[PDB]
Design a protein around this ligand. Structure first.
Ligand SMILES: Nc1ncnc2c1ncn2[C@@H]1O[C@@H]2COP(=O)(O)O[C@H]2[C@H]1O
Length: 146
């Protein structure tokens, strides 16, 4: 794992991540104990639409942008999350997410995501349903949602 050191930094970060706000401190500590970190350079693809996905991300520093069939669907900043949909639906990545500067993320693999973010699955599902608004506005496929 991280070590007592990184682990407390992770817990600091998670206390300000909106998607985890309904967790209690015990639950967030469990998430922190399993996180890993990595970085992306400007222009690098973090998630490519159509590929298989096994990783959940929280963006902890930087700026990234999501697009689907060459239309911009979301801008991302510190505290945002992405990459949950492939894990929840067992489908290919639904959008491409690209770094627009030097980006730092923390991440979980599929099994850890399901176990550790179990406490908030209702919130994750509601937010998945909410993706439909922009997809329909832009005339994009919504079967990736349901
Ligand atoms: N409107 C949207 N519809 C679907 N996925 C979106 C949308 N906006 C952002 N995303 C994110 O883009 C990610 C691409 O990979 P996933 O499909 O695993 O998870 C997806 C979501 O986290």
């Amino acid at each position: 794992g991280p070590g007592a050191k990184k682990r407390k930094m992770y817990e600091d970060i998670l206390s300000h991540v909106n998607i985890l706000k309904d967790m209690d401190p015990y639950e967030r500590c469990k998430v922190a104990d399993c996180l890993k970190s990595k970085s992306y350079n400007d222009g690098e693809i973090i998630i490519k639409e159509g590929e298989e996905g096994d990783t959940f991300f929280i963006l902890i520093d930087g700026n990234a942008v999501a697009s689907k069939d060459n239309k911009v669907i979301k801008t991302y900043t510190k505290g945002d999350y992405f990459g949950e949909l492939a894990l929840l639906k067992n489908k290919p990545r639904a959008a491409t997410i690209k770094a627009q500067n030097f980006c730092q993320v923390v991440y979980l693999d599929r099994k850890s995501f399901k176990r550790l973010l179990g406490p908030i699955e209702d919130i994750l599902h509601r937010n998945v349903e909410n993706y439909k608004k922009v997809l329909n506005e832009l005339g994009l496929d919504t079967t990736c949602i349901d």
